[PDB]
Amino acid sequence: GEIAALKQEIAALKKENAALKFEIAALKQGY
Amino acid sequence: GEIAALKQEIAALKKENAALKFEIAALKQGY
């Protein structure tokens, strides 16, 4: 399913944008 | 077009993951 694969990709990207965003905040708290 | 809108969304997310990633590197260089 093309739509399903495309949603999966978006899922993954959201997960990454969460993770890298958590990295930011953690650096600002640390530094 | 559902596929087109979905690709657009992925485009946007990639753009964000780039931006927040640039923020990271820039903080590590700074700090």
Residue A11 is encoded by which pair of tokens? 């899922």
Rounded (5°) CA angle B11-B15-B21? 145
Give the residue from A9, A21, A19, A5 showing the smallest Cα distance to B9.
Answer: A9
The DSSP output letter for A8 is: H
Q: Which residues of B touch A (CB under 8 A)?
A: 2-3, 6-7, 9-10, 13-14, 16-17, 20-21, 23-24, 27-28, 31
d(CA B27, CA B11): 25
Range of A22's domain?
1-31
The coordinates were experimentally obtained by X-ray
Resolution in A: 1.9
Give the residue from B9, B25, B19, B22 showing the smallest Cα distance to A13.
Answer: B9
Q: What is the total count of domains within chain B?
A: 1
Hunting for tokens 């978006």 — which residue is that? Answer: A10
